[PDB]
Amino acid sequence: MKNIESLFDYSAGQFEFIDHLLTMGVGVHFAALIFFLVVSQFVAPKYRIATALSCIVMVSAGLILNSQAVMWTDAYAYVDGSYQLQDLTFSNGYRYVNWMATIPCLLLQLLIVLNLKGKELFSTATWLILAAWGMIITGYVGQLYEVDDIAQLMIWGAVSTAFFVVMNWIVGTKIFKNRATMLGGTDSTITKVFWLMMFAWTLYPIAYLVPAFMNNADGVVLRQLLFTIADISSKVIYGLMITYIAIQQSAAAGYVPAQQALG
Amino acid sequence: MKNIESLFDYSAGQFEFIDHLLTMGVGVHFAALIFFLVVSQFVAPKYRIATALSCIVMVSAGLILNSQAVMWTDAYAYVDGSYQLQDLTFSNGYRYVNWMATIPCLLLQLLIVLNLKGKELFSTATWLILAAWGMIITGYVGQLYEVDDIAQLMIWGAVSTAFFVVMNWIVGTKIFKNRATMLGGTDSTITKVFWLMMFAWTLYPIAYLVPAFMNNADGVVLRQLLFTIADISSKVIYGLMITYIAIQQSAAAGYVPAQQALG
Amino acid sequence: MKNIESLFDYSAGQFEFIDHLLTMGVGVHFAALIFFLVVSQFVAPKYRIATALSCIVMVSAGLILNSQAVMWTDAYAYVDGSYQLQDLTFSNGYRYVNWMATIPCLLLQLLIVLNLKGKELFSTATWLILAAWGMIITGYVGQLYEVDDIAQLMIWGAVSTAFFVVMNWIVGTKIFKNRATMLGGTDSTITKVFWLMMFAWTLYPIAYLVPAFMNNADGVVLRQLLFTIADISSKVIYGLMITYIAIQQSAAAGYVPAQQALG
Amino acid sequence: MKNIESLFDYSAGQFEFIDHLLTMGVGVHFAALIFFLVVSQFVAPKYRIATALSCIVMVSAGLILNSQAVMWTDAYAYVDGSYQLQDLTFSNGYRYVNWMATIPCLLLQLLIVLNLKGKELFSTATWLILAAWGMIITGYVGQLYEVDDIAQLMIWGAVSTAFFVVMNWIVGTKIFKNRATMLGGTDSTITKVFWLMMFAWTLYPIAYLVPAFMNNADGVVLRQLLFTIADISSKVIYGLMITYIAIQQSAAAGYVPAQQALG
Amino acid sequence: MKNIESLFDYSAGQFEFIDHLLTMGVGVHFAALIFFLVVSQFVAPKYRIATALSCIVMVSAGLILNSQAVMWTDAYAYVDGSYQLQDLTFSNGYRYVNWMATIPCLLLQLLIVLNLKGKELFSTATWLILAAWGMIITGYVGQLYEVDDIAQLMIWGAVSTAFFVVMNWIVGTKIFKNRATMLGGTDSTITKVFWLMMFAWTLYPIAYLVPAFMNNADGVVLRQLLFTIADISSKVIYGLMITYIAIQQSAAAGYVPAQQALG
Numbered sequence A, B, C, D, E: 001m002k003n004i005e006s007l008f009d010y011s012a013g014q015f016e017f018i019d020h021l022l023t024m025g026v027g028v029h030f031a032a033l034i035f036f037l038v039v040s041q042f043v044a045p046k047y048r049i050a051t052a053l054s055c056i057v058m059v060s061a062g063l064i065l066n067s068q069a070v071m072w073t074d075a076y077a078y079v080d081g082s083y084q085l086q087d088l089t090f091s092n093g094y095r096y097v098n099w100m101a102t103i104p105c106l107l108l109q110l111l112i113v114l115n116l117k118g119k120e121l122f123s124t125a126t127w128l129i130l131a132a133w134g135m136i137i138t139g140y141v142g143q144l145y146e147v148d149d150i151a152q153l154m155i156w157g158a159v160s161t162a163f164f165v166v167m168n169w170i171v172g173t174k175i176f177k178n179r180a181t182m183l184g185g186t187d188s189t190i191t192k193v194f195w196l197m198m199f200a201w202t203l204y205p206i207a208y209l210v211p212a213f214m215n216n217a218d219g220v221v222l223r224q225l226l227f228t229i230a231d232i233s234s235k236v237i238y239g240l241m242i243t244y245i246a247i248q249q250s251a252a253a254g255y256v257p258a259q260q261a262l263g
């Protein structure tokens, strides 16, 4: 065994709570997809890539959640008044591997609305993507020791967090350096985004440490709840904020659909 | 066990009836989605978000119903002339957790067609959303006692209903204060909407009390029927009324597609 | 047991035929959906709702058929050279409950192309919908006696048929009263539609009586065949006729896309 | 048993090959669907129905293949180094019944680009559809004797082939009579289409005779391969040719999107 | 047995890793689909077919991955602390047969943006397609010997690689001959594409040889990882590069949406 989810038994209540969270996640992401498609038409072409990137992230994350959700119900059966493992195992590594695609998308959509262009765009994009792959690959290896070797967990943890800090650094640099060039009064909004990011992105490394400070079924419940809030904050709500920033700037630049959409 | 659905056995007739209601719910929500997409083009951009919000709700609700309906058939087997539970359990908590996303959407689409703007929009939105999360979270906890502790059910019930009343109060304030500014003769229509809301939204707390006044398989049938009607009324039919209000006001404001759509 | 489907065993040929019919139904409805979407652009806005209503009916009916089809293969297994029931039951009540949504849609799309407007539209709509819910609810109750009490079947049958007759009466009134105002030479076409309706809608009450005049597996084969033809006629082919009528009248009213679509 | 697929056992290689063919078929048809949607916009409205008809056929055929593919894996299990039948049966009749809808669509899209209009269109359409229903229904009955009575197979074979010949005759008449009126140099292209048709459509009656000249698991492999090629040829590649002919004639008629699409 | 996947048992970690890779692949392909649809509108009509070809490839490859991923979890069960085969077998042949459709699409989208036209287009298309079918069919036969006869593997390998070399030769000819006529400074970009192709396309023949140099569960892990990277590189990232080249050349040709999309 590799994940502590597979070590425990669950009460009907615990088991059903986790099923409730995973099922809700799936539908929020597919629903947000339809919304991004319908309002994409009010964004000026120069910023429409930012909205297209949200559609990518919604579909990708939605499909992973849908897998986790099926796996949860398939791995366990109710037998003698508790849910117990049965012939399949449950892991979180699905998420980790999926971040290899979605974290780039989240970061690129911020650079686009910050109005970076050309060399500066492509350069920052490259550094952010490699830092992120760095963070994710070392995280994935780490979480392979959550049952066996908590020492190893924390070691790879620390390396992973190195890359995190670099990435957060670059992002904040660019934000605070470019906030002033922002149109339509979105300098205020972009700052709220950066906060949202800091909160939501932090929940993930907390979830990564639950094995270390809560190795039991209540820990398991907590980790699944943290992942759920972090996904809805870091992907859906952040996507709504990026899109709203893009429509505001579109209108300021005199794109009429945007201007109409706002009155 | 946490829900009374899991306590009973069911006649083929009862069991099949409930599967018929759940199956129909799924398809009404996905069907209404196609309609909202096709007629969105007759709504002026200033109101198109209201229609997009219906698309979110139809997809989210549709996918939950689809889960409930699969779980129902999976949790039970026909064995000695009745349907009996088998190795999985059935709960309604799927709905509860999903309301955390859909009730905001329903409330925001009413504000948009009431023509609130700016500070007043954002302020009312915030208070309505927190009231709603309040109502939902305390309801979810409550319904965890429906088998064990009916006292606790009613206590958390009462708190939940507090938040309800605040929310209904704010909504009615805004409606009756802004009915006069409504274009295209939609002051009449908006009043019908507010009624629809009052009826449909009330079915939910009735369904929540069935354990208290009908703890048996006929109760279970009733609760599933109440949920079905309340979902079709509170989401699909209310969505059709909001969209019709939006087309009426679009045309009054001189949006041509809207004017054509009406003749 | 409520339905005679669940009383019999089936030869591989009978069993496979029924699976062939159900599977085909599913794909005809989803296919027709894409067609209605593509040609909706040639309908003038005044009539586009008629085409949108066909999309609703295609998705809703398609998803019911898809359920029936999975249930069929899940309820039975091949055991000693025949298909026999196993641990789940099969019913038709899925269809009945779904008519509560689709029959309104079918009736509304006829009124729209008949060019009814305002009070007359909303009034006729209301009477037709209540008649239809009347017919469907009493039919659903009826078919709960198909195994036990054929007397009761015929009694509720007769009530259901009352509502039918009212509904057919109103429809024909409106058709024959408004045929003359029809544009683009669609007075001829609308009459064909009314015939199609009469044939296709009648198959349903015949299928409802098979228990009474053929209580065996060949009856069961017949009922499934009748439902298949009646669904393709009453929904898909009638949809194609309504849309063709709408494009003809669009062109007559001088909508260019319609005129182009016809040359 | 009705089909010889259900009579044999299969090597892993045979069994896997057939699963490979069925799975690929499904995706080619759903992929071609997206292509027909995206390029439909370069076809003039007078010919856009021809492209819409391809979308119908892609969805319908894709969903049947998807069923066959699931049935294949469900009907057999690997047991003592071979795949053997288990509690479900496998048939081809799914395809037969589906031709009742798709063969009309294929034939109507050819008449549209041949530029037939009005009476001549509706008349030819009617004769071709009834011939085709004739061919398909007699084929279906035929193939019910593939295990029992090869005499009966060939008798119904012969009748089926009667209707074939009529249908091929009418089609060739129309093609060779109308080739000269065709725009944009598509007289060459339309002749290629007619050849493609002759080849692809012939594979079907060959597949129908395999029981007679190869009653074994290698026959079964051959029949599935013949069906796969014939489906890709008769639906996807023919669809791409009809669409290309329609864009060429659109441009010749001075539809600008078509002219742009070609340069 | 035909594939070495079916010969081994797997640790939870090995087994889970492979399920993580397969699951991610599915969602990247369906996600990239939505992106290609949204940005297709910024490509001039003359090049829009190149983008439509990416949509085909994303759906086709997505659906294959989705099958492989279900088969993997269905073929194995966790039993005595390892994953072991159970009653179904696992193969890679699904991919091979799917290349018969996707490799043509990949090659055709490169010719379109290289600006080949008419005779030269249709001629090169034909040679490249037959070369590719040659490479694929001989590969498929080869991989039927991976368990039994590694000699035969390498023989058919060698023939397959013949066709590879021809195909790479033609592609490079055309690229380096037409790089100079490329608009918008895409001569640089097209060269990067050709490199991408060389790397990504080569992984496949390496994966084909793993049986020869790593016949064990770690080899199996390697092959699945190689296929995952090769699919993301050869289809998704290459598609993003083709579409970017198409937007650049569209803008240079004075298509306004393209010019807007770039500023």
Ligand SMILES: CCCCCCCCCCCCCCCCCC(=O)OC[C@H](COP(=O)([O-])OCC[N+](C)(C)C)OC(=O)CCCCCCCCCCCCCCCCC
Pocket: A028, A031, A032, A033, A035, A188, A189, A192, A196, A229, A232, A233, A236, A237, A240, A241, A244, B056, B100, B101, B104, B118, B119, B120, B122, B129
């Ligand atoms: C399903 C949800 C439940 C799961 C739990 C989720 C955790 C909660 C996350 C914290 C919420 C943080 C809210 C940040 C909003 C910032 C305010 C603001 O300035 O907005 C930005 C800007 C405005 O900021 P500003 O700086 O311009 O201020 C402007 C104020 N006026 C105009 C009055 C002068 O506007 C936006 O629209 C941003 C997007 C709106 C935020 C979306 C709603 C958030 C919560 C709603 C419910 C969530 C579920 C619905 C999802 C369904 C979609 C498919």
Ligand SMILES: CCCCCCCCCCCCCCCCCC(=O)OC[C@H](COP(=O)([O-])OCC[N+](C)(C)C)OC(=O)CCCCCCCCCCCCCCCCC
Pocket: B028, B031, B032, B035, B188, B189, B192, B228, B229, B232, B233, B236, B237, B240, B241, B244, B245, C056, C100, C101, C104, C118, C119, C122, C129
């Ligand atoms: C996608 C699914 C299709 C619908 C599924 C249900 C079938 C239809 C149900 C009833 C009709 C639909 C509601 C009307 C739509 C909105 C009308 C509109 O555009 O404007 C409002 C119109 C306009 O009103 P007004 O104020 O402008 O005045 C009337 C209009 N003039 C002046 C032109 C005559 O108002 C109404 O018609 C009020 C609608 C109230 C409907 C109440 C129904 C609630 C209870 C139903 C429970 C059933 C649920 C379970 C079973 C259902 C089957 C699935």
Ligand SMILES: CCCCCCCCCCCCCCCCCC(=O)OC[C@H](COP(=O)([O-])OCC[N+](C)(C)C)OC(=O)CCCCCCCCCCCCCCCCC
Pocket: D028, D031, D032, D035, D188, D189, D190, D192, D196, D229, D232, D233, D236, D237, D240, D241, D244, E056, E100, E101, E104, E118, E119, E122, E129
């Ligand atoms: C949707 C996904 C694609 C799936 C198929 C992928 C494989 C590609 C092979 C065929 C595709 C190309 C055919 C359509 C060409 C577009 C039409 C066009 O523009 O004009 C036609 C052209 C036009 O001819 P013309 O008469 O206008 O003159 C030539 C045109 N100029 C002058 C401009 C050069 O005609 C042809 O090229 C005929 C092509 C048809 C022959 C098809 C052979 C295949 C037969 C079946 C065997 C293969 C099936 C099994 C393999 C499995 C595949 C997955």
Ligand SMILES: CCCCCCCCCCCCCCCCCC(=O)OC[C@H](COP(=O)([O-])OCC[N+](C)(C)C)OC(=O)CCCCCCCCCCCCCCCCC
Pocket: A056, A100, A101, A104, A105, A118, A119, A122, A129, E028, E031, E032, E035, E188, E189, E192, E229, E232, E233, E236, E237, E240, E241, E244, E245
């Ligand atoms: C990534 C998903 C899962 C993890 C698996 C890892 C992927 C496989 C590893 C190999 C990656 C190879 C990268 C080569 C691409 C770089 C070449 C390039 O772009 O050249 C510059 C070229 C242009 O080069 P140029 O020649 O014009 O010069 C530079 C241009 N100016 C001057 C304007 C700055 O850019 C493009 O072509 C633009 C779009 C292509 C770039 C997109 C690739 C993203 C790579 C990371 C993937 C992240 C998410 C992927 C999934 C998305 C989901 C839909």
Ligand SMILES: CCCCCCCCCCCC(=O)OC[C@H](COP(=O)(O)OCC[N+](C)(C)C)OC(=O)CCCCCCCCCCC
Pocket: A039, A240, A243, A244, A247, A261, A262, A263, B049, B104, B105, B108, B117, B118, B121, B122, B125, B126, B129, B130
């Ligand atoms: C913890 C609880 C906090 C959460 C509550 C936050 C407030 C709610 C949001 C405000 C309402 C709003 O966004 O409406 C939509 C606003 C319109 O408003 P406006 O044009 O600014 O109005 C001022 C009007 N003038 C200028 C005439 C004065 O944007 C738009 O049309 C753009 C559409 C895309 C933006 C995405 C919106 C996301 C909504 C989906 C959430 C489920």
Ligand SMILES: CCCCCCCCCCCC(=O)OC[C@H](COP(=O)(O)OCC[N+](C)(C)C)OC(=O)CCCCCCCCCCC
Pocket: B039, B240, B241, B243, B244, B247, B261, B262, B263, C049, C104, C105, C108, C112, C116, C117, C118, C119, C121, C122, C125, C126, C129, C130
């Ligand atoms: C027991 C329950 C009874 C309730 C029955 C109500 C009947 C429905 C009313 C007609 C609606 C219609 O189809 O079209 C409604 C309108 C046509 O309005 P009009 O009055 O002709 O406008 C002309 C006004 N004059 C007469 C003064 C000149 O078109 C539209 O573009 C409106 C957009 C559609 C909004 C969503 C409603 C469609 C729901 C359909 C799914 C069931």
Ligand SMILES: CCCCCCCCCCCC(=O)OC[C@H](COP(=O)(O)OCC[N+](C)(C)C)OC(=O)CCCCCCCCCCC
Pocket: C039, C240, C243, C244, C247, C261, C262, C263, D049, D104, D105, D108, D117, D118, D119, D121, D122, D125, D126, D129, D130
């Ligand atoms: C098989 C799936 C059917 C899909 C086609 C029908 C949908 C109609 C949608 C309208 C689109 C449109 O614009 O239609 C228009 C087109 C073109 O006809 P037209 O313009 O009148 O001809 C020219 C008229 N002049 C001469 C006055 C200019 O009509 C069609 O294509 C209809 C195809 C024929 C129908 C076949 C009926 C035979 C059935 C026999 C049963 C045994």
Ligand SMILES: CCCCCCCCCCCC(=O)OC[C@H](COP(=O)(O)OCC[N+](C)(C)C)OC(=O)CCCCCCCCCCC
Pocket: D039, D240, D241, D243, D244, D247, D261, D262, D263, E046, E049, E104, E105, E108, E116, E117, E118, E121, E122, E125, E126, E129
């Ligand atoms: C895998 C194939 C699927 C996709 C192809 C389907 C095309 C149909 C839609 C037309 C859209 C359009 O406009 O196509 C545009 C382009 C061609 O026209 P052009 O270069 O713009 O101008 C023409 C140049 N002149 C104006 C100067 C004369 O056509 C193609 O690409 C042609 C198809 C590719 C070659 C066929 C493959 C070889 C077959 C042999 C295999 C045994």
Ligand SMILES: CCCCCCCCCCCC(=O)OC[C@H](COP(=O)(O)OCC[N+](C)(C)C)OC(=O)CCCCCCCCCCC
Pocket: A046, A049, A104, A105, A108, A116, A117, A118, A119, A121, A122, A125, A126, A129, A130, E039, E240, E243, E244, E247, E261, E262, E263
């Ligand atoms: C990663 C998933 C999706 C990435 C997007 C793919 C592009 C395809 C569509 C282009 C549409 C368009 O028009 O693109 C336009 C913009 C660029 O032009 P601009 O911003 O207007 O600047 C205007 C100034 N110029 C004219 C000088 C450029 O391109 C992008 O932003 C592409 C994203 C670049 C980041 C790539 C990172 C490389 C990763 C390497 C790590 C190993």
Ligand SMILES: *C/C=C(C)/C=C/C=C(C)/C=C/C1=C(C)CCCC1(C)C
Pocket: A099, A102, A103, A106, A135, A136, A138, A139, A140, A142, A157, A160, A161, A164, A201, A202, A204, A205, A208, A231, A234, A235
């Ligand atoms: C939608 C997904 C998002 C935004 C995911 C973000 C994930 C992280 C920021 C992960 C952080 C981690 C560390 C910094 C150390 C521990 C391991 C990780 C990878 C979970």
Ligand SMILES: *C/C=C(C)/C=C/C=C(C)/C=C/C1=C(C)CCCC1(C)C
Pocket: B099, B102, B103, B106, B135, B136, B138, B139, B140, B157, B160, B161, B164, B201, B202, B204, B205, B208, B231, B234, B235
């Ligand atoms: C589509 C979903 C809708 C509109 C749901 C509405 C939900 C409620 C009005 C729930 C209300 C409750 C109470 C007021 C008390 C008991 C607990 C609740 C949560 C059922």
Ligand SMILES: *C/C=C(C)/C=C/C=C(C)/C=C/C1=C(C)CCCC1(C)C
Pocket: C099, C102, C103, C106, C135, C136, C138, C139, C140, C142, C157, C160, C161, C164, C201, C202, C204, C205, C208, C231, C234, C235
């Ligand atoms: C697509 C569905 C349609 C058009 C359904 C039509 C159904 C009927 C007209 C049903 C009629 C019935 C009677 C008149 C008597 C017996 C009971 C019914 C409900 C089957």
Ligand SMILES: *C/C=C(C)/C=C/C=C(C)/C=C/C1=C(C)CCCC1(C)C
Pocket: D099, D102, D103, D106, D135, D136, D138, D139, D140, D142, D157, D160, D161, D164, D201, D202, D204, D205, D208, D231, D234, D235
């Ligand atoms: C995509 C489906 C197509 C083009 C279907 C074609 C089917 C046939 C031409 C079937 C023909 C038959 C005969 C000529 C004789 C034997 C029976 C049939 C039905 C196989």
Ligand SMILES: *C/C=C(C)/C=C/C=C(C)/C=C/C1=C(C)CCCC1(C)C
Pocket: E099, E102, E103, E106, E135, E136, E138, E139, E140, E142, E157, E160, E161, E164, E201, E202, E204, E205, E208, E231, E234, E235
């Ligand atoms: C999306 C899929 C792509 C680009 C597939 C490419 C496949 C190949 C280049 C396969 C090549 C092979 C050889 C050159 C030798 C061994 C056998 C093959 C078929 C794997």
Ligand SMILES: CCCCCCCCCCCCCCCCCC
Pocket: D011, D013, D014, D017, D228, E097, E100, E136, E137, E140, E141, E144
């Ligand atoms: C033990 C017998 C081995 C398997 C039997 C079938 C033989 C497979 C070889 C056929 C050639 C490959 C075809 C690949 C392209 C697919 C056609 C659409």
Ligand SMILES: CCCCCCCCCCCCCCCC
Pocket: A011, A013, A014, A017, A228, A229, B097, B100, B137, B140, B141, B144
């Ligand atoms: C008996 C054990 C049950 C443990 C679960 C109870 C959790 C109650 C919190 C309700 C949170 C609902 C909102 C979900 C957040 C997205």
